Design a protein around this ligand. Structure first.
Ligand code: UQ9
Ligand code: PC1
Ligand code: PC1
Ligand code: 3PE
Ligand code: 3PE
Ligand code: NDP
Ligand code: UQ1
Ligand code: SF4
Ligand code: SF4
Ligand code: ZN
Lengths: 340, 83, 174, 198, 386, 43, 314, 157
């Protein structure tokens, strides 16, 4: 079972990767389908969002490259038919909020384990599972701790299943960068420990995507637990200010106990419509980035990471005011890099 | 499957397009329809075949039903004629 | 022969006439009368789903492949329908069917490429490809618009009764 | 058979000599086609002079320029064949003055003689690449702002080399080398049998 | 740059693709540099790769308001190169549908002009009449617009049995419909203002910038290629060119309403005097054989097969043939090698010249004036962009 | 076999001329009725 | 009670405001040989409610612009227009104001800002150019609009709109002062930016350019309510509906009839006329109308005195 | 009934009815298929009757009908205007010249389809797609909207 790769390399060409991608509608997802579609791969995008929302993905895929299937996580049958004819399964299923009838363990662990079990039954050549970076079963945030439980299980449902483990991602439409920039509405921008001792290493979304895609088309990655990290680390302080810097909005980093702040996250979490901050988020944000000790990701998988400052201008431009939108990054001052 | 037999194997990718959808195939497969057509008996050595209806048929050809060994078949209608 | 579209005394009667035209907007009132008049005319619109705008037999509409009454598809793959298509829409590849006859393995009209010229209707010697009456075949996805032999043959079977009536009405003219 | 009126064939022929004598310089091969049409052919340097004489001569007033075009015969050393078609409202007649220009040997501009040519000359530069000196403002009229290559040249691929699609990653329209999903089927149509010229 | 703004391509004003960059000192236009090619599609290069009969459908699309009149120009051109001329009935047909098409264009130009000005009821009044005309096209060609009916050797198929009668009922009444528009716009106390003395073009300047259309006729120059150089049987009819004086948006308008009137005079005649006969040349060499003949006679099949698959095989030569399309002089310069597919086919578009004049017409004019002048040139971006 | 042609004797005649009617109250008469209205109103 | 009397006088007008768009999209239709909207609901009655819901649901995109001079502008437009119905004297008014017409003139004048604020807020060229011209003709027309009223008042005796019901107990103020009615009607057409005088936000898309969904709707609602209010002011000041003290509703019944017909008239004007040029529009007011109005203003200070008809104050 | 799922469906329907009854289109009017749309707006086939307004600017437009060839120069604009419309927006491609490439598919200046520049919801076929056909296409967009169930997915998400 395979498809000889013919063509010159662009759209309307063939690469031979038929791939179910269950959580494509996501920020990372959007990018994964982009490269897969650019390369000419056959992409099956399972969806449970309404057809109007899935429209953005149609255009990057060539005619007949993208197939959309109706799928429900609780219904095992839907996952069954999606992977029927795929040979690569990529799992990007996660939500930082715990919704009323999908709890954190269910989205991070139960849904992937069933999905991986299905492709072992189907006979998919490889499964790529994505879990957050620095994730341990006894870690601070449940999301991370659970995700850690998950990477284990899926190994037993699907052995030698690649497990890329990305850091918080930097990209347009990302949270890491937009969240902080959107603190503008808040007059003061709380920062636990005044934004210190939580050094963070962002990674451009595309780098992550390209990396993921390259995995699909490379035999070197099996059972590998890569870690796409980034080109430079940062104390949360510079990051926050830098953001506000490009956004050209004042910065008032205010110390507030994480204790009390976990409570603020609880407050937004209470909100019915997509809480903006999450108790589980808060912890994550002040959860220090772990030093790379796992399998090298970017570069190792073939893409050289892209510095944050380089593309930050595009992500934070909309956050900016009426004036200062023509302000460009090089007249602006890039913040210092703290490896710690 | 279809008139030609276009079919996708299990390992065959490019069969997903039908997942949760339907394929276009034909009942009344023509391959067998003229075979179902009776052999037009004739008296003359040669016969015409307007296709039926003149202008609304095929360019008229004259078939040589000269050998009972073979029922002439107008290359256009696939109609066998029995001398 | 030519004509001057706009090629051109002052009397109280005249002036008073002209001044009244400017002062009490006499010509403007004339224009209002015309629109009030139609307000009273019967509207020309048709209930679109219930009543349909009339199309006579030559309307080109949607492509279909016909079959002989016996049931053998008319096309014999001469492939000049492909030759004369202006847009390169029709793609035909053929091979001798086991019967020994000549038939098209694949006949694909790309309707998005097709500009509905109706020359294919013209060119076919057996008149296998015809411009069918239906114009309502709008589709949610681009792929549905690309049509293979099975869709066109199915289109032909569905509309054969009207296609036959339409060709019956217009063949003397052609 | 078309309703030829020899009355014309002669009168236009006679004018063709008239012009040939009036401008012995710059004018060669003046011929009246079998279609009752005259086609003075001029050396490229005679662009300004021959037109002006036709625009402003009592016995030949050719006030409006119907068209300026450039056939491209790749075989011909001078690739382009700039053709100017002109109309006489007063004499109810039309004439064709055609010159030859190579790719990098520019022709003079006649925007002075007829301002109609301001646009057509820009059209000829954009499509064929001939350049017109003394043109007020030469600039692409029909092709895209960043288009590279002159399209109507016989040596330019129909489909071209670039096509556009929207890319999400970059959230902006982006050229890519053309990749076509059904190449233009190049039917060979010439028949190996000629027609004995009448 | 006088707050230079670019007139919108999507703008309801314009025909959809006019990016008119205009530097405007407040509400006064200092300079208009129209941009073109928003609808360039390659029509001239594509034709070189197609046979004569498969390039006929391109001409309908060049300026599709005037669907057929454009075909007649290619027809005539291909007929000249072959030295073949269409049969008598076909000629009258082409003049019949040639004129019907002129009305269709003028109903488009006058009513669309008003919609940009702000009068919206004339468009709905006359689009119903248009609709009725389209139906003629459909019942003659098969397509509402983009017919492909006028082919290089005559018409494709004789008129249906009954069309002439209906092209009468309509013609018998259409006048009143033009009359109505009039009672709404010709003398409106306000139409005149926005149109009168806007975009005046001198006579000498109109010839110089190659206007060649109503635009010339509106300035008082008397030139109708249909009377000066008769094509088809427009010679056998009798009509009056509507010349204008004090050429300005209002005067030319009046001219377009008058040719709508004169075309009804030409249509009447064509119905009164159309001859019994054939509608396509009898030379199977140029015109495709009748389907009864190709299905019973060998020479006819061979001629049908070769004509559809290969082509006319026009003798080598070149011609510039111009008709009087509703917009103005539409001409095809068709250079042709002995091959069945053309070598060049520059389409002269009445419109490439007219737009150019926008600059010399709209000087020291307000934003609203520019909208009025694009209307008085009947710019269809298909012909300009080709 | 029949060919759609003009009816025998030709069709009837069509109008090719504007029939717009110059109908209006004369100006003096128009002003007088109006001025009379104001005079009555003022009184 | 008074609260109930605020629902009535508001809702009823809002519901009627919705039915005007419908009677606009049908009267324009039949004039143009088309049925107009009849498929949604019965005879299109549910049509106004339908797009209201579509408009509010669609995203109110805030341009990459002010965020207040953007949201203040539609609120001001709806607030002033609905507010000006407060003092209108149908039968007897809700809040009778001794200087009532000055209230109506002042409240109208304030709406010109909303146009100015929306145009500055959008921060795109089409909006600013449109707003500057729009503000210009609105206040230009205000100058003749005000003088035309001052002529009226001097023959009414007071600024209170309630007095005209007693002034017009024998004859409409159209008979006298018809020359100004016309000039009040044309000015009412300009101030509601309706057709003959609707250059802003024309086919050239001014202060709705950047306005979509909810903001679009509020001005929108405002314009149409105004369309009615100004017509209603014509139906009190110049066409005086018959008033019988014993039965107050025949006043409102005829007020209903005259207001609907004059509201129908500007609908009919729109379809019938092309739009005037920007300067053509100001040429009318400053050259054609202002000299007529100022002179007829003096005639209305003289008619009272020498005809010994000075109106009774109160 | 009160079980929320039912309540939700009904609400959604109302929302769908409002958007589906009043669709305000905008016509880029590229090429000619624009003439066949002006016919829809015209009296035989009144678009307004259905709730479709004759004209609308991009800010207030629910559906964009791309009529005509989307040439490479106009391709950046189309997008801009698509990107300048509200959150509930839709695109009805009209014409073989915009469904795919049409007679001008192999040209160097024509984008082979608008669905390469704007996501397309209903493709209306025909070189001059008949006005009735557009009307059929606009009506199928109305059935597409009717089926959309945005709040029920919210509730079940
Ligand atoms: C570009 O934006 C547009 C315009 O500007 C030119 C329009 O005016 C128009 C044309 C105007 C129309 C008459 C149709 C649109 C009509 C409406 C928005 C009516 C809105 C209805 C309402 C808000 C009703 C109000 C109801 C209540 C609050 C009642 C409460 C008790 C359109 C369609 C448009 O798209
Ligand atoms: C029913 C409602 C009215 C319908 C009007 C249009 C239909 C009739 C059309 C008649 C026609 O076409 O000819 C018009 C004709 C057309 O004029 P014409 O241009 O043909 O020539 C007449 C004028 N001369 C000859 C001097 C040039 O115009 C007139 O007859 C005079 C109209 C005067 C209008 C004055 C302004 C309007 C009235 C303002 C005062 C208030 C009146 C009452 C207001 C409401 C009170 C409740
Ligand atoms: C009741 C409150 C009345 C307040 C009147 C204040 C008068 C002094 C000016 C205050 C506004 C200017 C200022 O200093 O703040 C800037 C701010 C700027 O707000 P903004 O966000 O609209 O302006 C900038 C917009 N961006 C940056 C996005 C381009 O002013 C405001 O926040 C709004 C002030 C509203 C004033 C009250 C209006 C009431 C109704 C009036 C009719
Ligand atoms: C003792 C006696 C003392 C008193 C003496 C009185 C003498 C008689 C009265 C004299 C004045 C009568 C006319 C007053 C109003 C008209 C004023 C006027 O001149 O109109 C301006 C304009 C002129 O037109 P135009 O050609 O642009 O200008 C030419 C000159 N430059 O005209 C226009 O442009 C009009 C544009 C109108 C657009 C909308 C038209 C709507 C028409 C239908 C509604 C008509 C009014 C209905 C009123 C209903 C009741 C309120
Ligand atoms: C939004 C802003 C514009 C709102 C619409 C325009 C409101 C115009 C108000 C004009 C002033 C009120 C008025 O003229 O009469 C009020 C009346 C006093 O007049 P009168 O009844 O003659 O008194 C003696 C005989 N009874 O009786 C009274 O005095 C009542 C008390 C005064 C009420 C005045 C209006 C109050 C408005 C309150 C909201 C204002 C919101 C302002 C927002 C902008 C920021 C400040
Ligand atoms: N961006 C981040 O913060 C980072 C994320 N990651 C990991 O990468 C993955 C993708 O990230 P990102 O794209 O930001 O995540 P998103 O929040 O964009 O969601 C990803 C996808 O998961 C789907 N999904 C969520 N819940 C369910 C459910 N109950 N049933 C079915 N599908 C569901 C969503 O579909 P729909 O919304 O249509 O239901 C969405 O398309 C995540 O799983 C995360 O663990 C790693 C590092 C950083
Ligand atoms: C033909 O050119 C065009 C216009 O101007 C003439 C339009 O206004 C419009 C806009 C018309 C409608 C149906 C809103 C279109 C579609 C167009 O392409
Ligand atoms: S022409 Fe008619 S028969 Fe010959 S191939 Fe095309 S369709 Fe089949
Ligand atoms: S599709 Fe046919 S009609 Fe629509 S634009 Fe392309 S050519 Fe003109
Ligand atoms: Zn046969």
């Amino acid at each position: 079972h395979a498809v000889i790769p013919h063509g010159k390399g662009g759209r309307s060409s063939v690469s031979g990767v038929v791939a179910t991608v269950f959580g494509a509608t996501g920020f990372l997802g959007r990018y994964v389908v982009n490269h897969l579609g650019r390369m000419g791969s056959q992409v099956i995008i399972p969806y449970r969002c309404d057809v109007y929302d899935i429209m953005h993905l149609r255009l990057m895929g060539d005619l007949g490259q993208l197939t959309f299937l109706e799928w429900d996580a609780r219904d095992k049958d839907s996952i069954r038919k999606a992977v029927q004819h795929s040979n690569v399964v990529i799992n990007l299923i996660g939500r930082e909020w715990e919704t009323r009838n999908f709890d954190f363990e269910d989205v991070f662990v139960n849904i992937p384990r069933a999905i991986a079990q299905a492709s072992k039954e189907a006979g998919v050549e490889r499964f790529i599972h994505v879990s957050h970076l620095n994730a341990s079963m006894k870690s601070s945030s449940k999301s991370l701790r659970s995700k850690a439980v998950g990477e284990k299980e899926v190994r037993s449902v699907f052995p030698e299943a690649i497990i890329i483990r990305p850091s918080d991602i930097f990209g347009r439409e990302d949270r890491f960068l937009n969240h902080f920039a959107n603190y503008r509405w808040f007059l003061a921008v709380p920062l636990v420990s005044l934004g210190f001792k939580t050094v963070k290493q962002p990674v451009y979304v595309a780098d992550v995507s390209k990396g993921i895609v390259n995995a699909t088309k490379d035999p070197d990655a099996v059972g590998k637990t890569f870690a796409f990290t980034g080109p430079n680390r940062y104390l949360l302080f510079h990051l926050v200010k830098y953001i506000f810097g490009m956004t050209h909005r004042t910065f008032i980093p205010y110390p507030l106990p994480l204790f009390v702040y976990s409570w603020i996250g609880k407050l937004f979490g209470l909100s019915p419509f997509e809480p903006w901050t999450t108790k589980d988020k808060v912890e994550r944000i002040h959860i220090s980035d772990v030093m790379p000790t796992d399998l090298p990701g970017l570069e190792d998988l073939g893409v050289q990471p892209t510095p944050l400052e380089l593309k930050s201008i595009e992500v934070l431009r909309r956050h900016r005011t009426y004036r200062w939108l023509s302000s460009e990054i090089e007249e602006t001052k890039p913040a210092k890099t703290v490896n710690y | 499957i279809t008139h030609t037999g276009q079919v996708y194997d299990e390992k065959d990718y490019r069969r997903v397009r039908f997942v949760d959808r339907q394929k276009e195939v034909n009942e009344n497969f023509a391959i067998d329809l003229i075979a179902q057509q009776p052999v037009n008996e004739v008296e003359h050595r040669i016969i015409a075949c307007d296709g039926g209806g003149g202008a609304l048929g095929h360019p008229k050809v004259y078939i040589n039903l000269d050998k009972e060994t073979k029922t002439g078949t107008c290359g256009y209608c696939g109609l066998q004629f029995k001398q | 022969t030519y004509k001057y579209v706009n090629k051109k005394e002052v009397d109280m009667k005249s002036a008073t006439d002209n001044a009244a035209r400017i002062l009490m907007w006499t010509e403007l009132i004339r224009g209002l009368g015309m629109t009030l008049s139609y307000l009273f005319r019967e509207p020309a619109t048709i209930n679109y789903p219930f009543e349909k705008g009339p199309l006579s037999p030559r309307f080109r509409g949607e492509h279909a492949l016909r079959r002989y009454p016996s049931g053998e598809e008319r096309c014999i793959a001469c492939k000049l329908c492909e030759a004369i298509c202006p847009a390169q829409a029709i793609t035909i590849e053929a091979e001798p069917r086991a019967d020994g006859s000549r038939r098209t393995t694949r006949y694909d009209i790309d309707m998005t490429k097709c500009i509905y010229c109706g020359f294919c209707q013209e060119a076919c010697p057996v008149d296998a490809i015809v411009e069918g009456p239906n114009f309502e075949f709008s589709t949610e996805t681009h792929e549905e618009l690309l049509y293979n032999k099975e869709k066109l043959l199915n289109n032909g079977d569905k509309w054969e009764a009207e296609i036959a009536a339409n060709i019956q009405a217009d063949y003397l003219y052609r | 058979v078309r309703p030829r009126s020899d009355v014309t064939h002669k009168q236009l022929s006679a004018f063709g000599e008239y012009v040939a004598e009036i401008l012995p310089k710059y004018v060669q091969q003046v011929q009246v086609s079998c279609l009752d049409e005259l086609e003075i052919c001029i050396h490229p340097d005679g662009v300004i002079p021959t037109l002006t004489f036709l625009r402003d001569h009592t016995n030949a007033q050719f006030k409006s320029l119907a068209d300026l075009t450039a056939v491209d015969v790749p075989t011909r050393q001078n690739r382009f064949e700039i053709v100017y078609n002109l109309l006489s409202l007063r004499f109810n007649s039309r004439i064709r003055v055609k010159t030859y220009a190579d790719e990098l040997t520019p022709i003079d501009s006649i925007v002075s003689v007829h301002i109609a040519a301001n646009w057509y000359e820009r059209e000829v530069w954009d499509m064929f690449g001939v350049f017109f000196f003394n043109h007020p403002d030469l600039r692409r009229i029909l092709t895209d702002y960043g288009f590279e290559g002159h399209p109507f040249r016989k040596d330019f691929p129909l489909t071209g080399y670039v096509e556009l699609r929207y890319d999400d990653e970059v959230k902006r329209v982006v050229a890519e080398p053309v990749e076509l999903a059904q190449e233009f089927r190049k039917f060979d149509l010439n028949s190996p049998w000629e027609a004995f010229p009448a | 740059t006088n707050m230079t703004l670019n007139f919108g391509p999507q703008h309801p004003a314009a025909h959809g693709v006019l990016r008119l960059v205009l530097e405007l000192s407040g509400e006064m236009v200092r300079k208009c540099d129209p941009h073109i090619g928003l609808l360039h599609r390659g029509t001239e290069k594509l034709i070189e790769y197609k046979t004569y009969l498969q390039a006929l459908p391109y001409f309908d699309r060049l300026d599709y308001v005037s669907m057929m009149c454009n075909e007649q120009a290619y027809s005539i051109a291909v007929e000249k190169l072959l030295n073949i001329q269409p049969p008598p009935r076909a000629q009258w047909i082409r003049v019949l549908f040639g004129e019907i098409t002129r009305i269709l264009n003028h109903i488009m130009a006058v009513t669309t002009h008003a919609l940009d000005i702000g009068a919206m009821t004339p468009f709905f009044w006359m689009f119903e009449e248009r609709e009725k005309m389209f139906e003629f096209y459909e019942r003659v060609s098969g397509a509402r617009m983009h017919a492909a009916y006028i082919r290089p050797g005559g018409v494709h198929q004789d008129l249906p049995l009954g069309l002439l009668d209906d092209i009468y009922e309509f013609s018998k009444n259409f006048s009143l419909r033009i009359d109505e528009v009039e009672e709404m716009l010709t003398n409106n106390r306000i139409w005149r203002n926005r149109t009168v003395d806007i975009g005046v073009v001198t006579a000498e300047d109109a010839l110089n910038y190659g206007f060649s259309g109503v635009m010339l006729r509106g300035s008082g120059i008397q030139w109708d290629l249909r009377k000066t150089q008769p094509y088809d049987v427009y010679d056998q009819v009798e009509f009056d060119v509507p010349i204008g004086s004090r050429g300005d948006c209002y005067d030319r308008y009046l001219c377009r309403v008058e040719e709508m009137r004169q075309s009804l005079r030409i249509i009447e005649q064509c119905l009164n005097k159309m001859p019994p006969g054939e509608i396509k040349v009898d030379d199977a060499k140029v015109s495709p054989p009748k389907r009864a003949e190709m299905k019973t006679s060998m020479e006819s099949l061979i001629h049908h097969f070769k004509l559809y698959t290969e082509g006319y095989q026009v003798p080598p030569g070149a011609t510039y043939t111009a008709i009087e399309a509703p917009k103005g002089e539409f001409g095809v310069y068709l250079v042709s090698d002995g091959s069945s597919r053309p070598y060049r086919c520059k389409i002269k578009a009445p419109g490439f010249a007219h737009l150019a004049g926008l600059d010399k017409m709209s000087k020291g004019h307000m934003l609203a004036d520019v909208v009025a002048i694009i209307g008085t040139q009947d710019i269809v971006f298909g012909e300009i962009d080709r | 076999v029949k060919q759609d042609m003009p009816p025998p004797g030709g069709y009837g005649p069509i109008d090719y001329k504007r029939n717009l009617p110059r109908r209006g109250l004369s100006g003096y008469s128009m002003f007088a009725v109006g001025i009379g209205a104001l005079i009555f109103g003022y009184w | 009670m008074f609260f109930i009397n605020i629902l009535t006088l508001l809702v009823p007008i809002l519901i009627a405001m919705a039915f005007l768009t419908l009677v606009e999209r049908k009267i324009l239709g039949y004039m143009q040989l088309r049925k107009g909207p009849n498929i949604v609901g019965p005879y299109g009655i549910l049509q106004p409610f339908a797009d209201a819901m579509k408009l509010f649901m669609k995203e109110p995109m805030r341009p990459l612009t002010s965020m207040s001079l953007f949201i203040i502008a539609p609120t001001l437009s709806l607030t002033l227009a609905l507010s000006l119905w407060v003092p209108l004297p149908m039968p007897h008014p809700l809040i009778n104001l001794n200087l009532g017409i000055l209230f109506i003139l002042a409240t109208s004048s304030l709406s010109v800002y909303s146009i100015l604020w929306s145009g500055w807020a959008s921060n795109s060229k089409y909006s600013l150019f449109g707003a500057l011209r729009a503000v210009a003709q609105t206040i230009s027309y205000e100058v003749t609009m005000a003088i035309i009223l001052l002529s009226v008042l001097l023959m009414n005796g007071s600024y209170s709109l309630q007095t005209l019901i007693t002034t017009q107990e024998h004859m409409w103020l159209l008979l006298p002062a018809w020359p100004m009615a016309m000039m009040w009607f044309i000015s009412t057409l300009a101030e509601t930016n309706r057709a003959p005088f609707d250059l802003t936000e024309g086919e050239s898309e001014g202060f709705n350019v950047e306005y979509a969904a909810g903001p679009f709707a509020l001005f929108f609602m405002a314009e149409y309510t105004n369309i009615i209010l100004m017509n209603a002011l014509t139906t009190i000041i110049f066409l005086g509906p018959l008033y019988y003290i014993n039965l107050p509703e025949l006043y409102s019944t005829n007020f209903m009839m005259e207001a609907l017909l004059l509201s129908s008239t500007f609908l009919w004007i729109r379809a019938s006329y092309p739009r005037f040029r920007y300067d053509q529009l100001m040429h009318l007011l400053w050259k054609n109308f202002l000299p007529l109005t100022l002179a007829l203003c003096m005639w209305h200070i003289s008619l009272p005195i020498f005809t010994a008809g000075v109106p009774p104050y109160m | 009934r009160s079980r929320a799922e039912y309540v939700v469906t009904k609400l959604d329907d109302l929302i769908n009815w409002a958007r589906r009854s009043s669709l305000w289109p905008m016509t880029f009017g590229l090429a000619c298929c624009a003439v066949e749309m002006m016919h829809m707006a015209a009296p035989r086939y009144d678009m307004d009757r259905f709730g479709v307004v004759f004209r609308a600017s991009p800010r207030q437009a629910d559906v964009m009908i791309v009529a005509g060839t989307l040439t490479n120069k106009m391709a950046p604009a189309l997008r801009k205007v698509y990107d300048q419309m509200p959150e509930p927006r839709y695109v009805v491609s009209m014409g073989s010249c915009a469904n795919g490439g049409g007679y001008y598919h192999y040209s160097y200046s024509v984008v082979r389809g608008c669905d390469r520049i704007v996501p397309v919801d209903i493709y209306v076929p025909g070189c001059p797609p008949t006005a009735e056909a557009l009307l059929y296409g606009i009506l199928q967009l109305q059935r597409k909207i009717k089926r959309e169930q945005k709040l029920k997915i919210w509730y079940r998400r």
